[PDB]
């Protein structure tokens, strides 16, 4: 219950996906794209009154590349990082690989792809295809900055 409950109480305000399709699903991925701004759109405007306005993310014509940028806030200094992910073909079963490549001074990272929890794939696998985007981000980079930024900032590489 008790990770039923977490997941719920970090996502519940944002826009459930619906639509199972991939980049080259025609006219579902078109559908799907619409969900993940939807989603996105929604936790964003919800961060504002969080005073957790932590990310922005752009994506080609075809939604297919994703880049932007996130910033962390560690004893009221702030940090910036510019963010990228590719889709891969098979989502949204599988999740994308978010990259922060100028971070390529952590172990915590393969080229830029960051090194999330072994708990997060079972966590995304539980709930396809209703975690979008926003989910990657509120679930997996989110919970990754909170570890990984305090981290790298003691050990003086930030």
């Not at 993310?57 to 939604?63: A, D, I, R, T, V």
């Not at 940028?69 to 989502?91: A, N, Q, S, V």
């Not at 539980?126 to 790298?152: C, Q, S, T, W, Y």
Request: charge should be negative.
């Amino acid at each position: 219950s008790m990770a039923d409950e977490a997941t719920r109480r970090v996502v519940s305000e944002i826009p459930v996906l619906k639509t199972n399709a991939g980049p080259r699903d025609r006219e579902l991925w078109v559908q799907r794209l619409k969900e993940e701004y939807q989603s996105l759109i929604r936790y964003v405007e919800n961060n504002k009154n969080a005073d957790n306005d932590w990310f922005r993310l752009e994506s080609n014509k075809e939604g297919t590349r994703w880049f932007g940028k996130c910033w962390y806030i560690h004893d009221l200094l702030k940090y910036e990082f510019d963010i990228e992910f590719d889709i891969p073909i098979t989502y949204p079963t599988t999740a994308p690989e978010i990259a922060v490549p100028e971070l390529d001074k952590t172990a915590k990272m393969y080229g830029g792809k960051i090194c999330l929890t072994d708990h997060f794939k079972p966590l995304w696998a539980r709930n396809v295809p209703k975690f979008g985007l926003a989910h990657l981000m509120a679930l997996g980079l989110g919970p990754h900055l909170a570890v990984e930024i305090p981290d790298l900032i003691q050990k003086g590489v930030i």
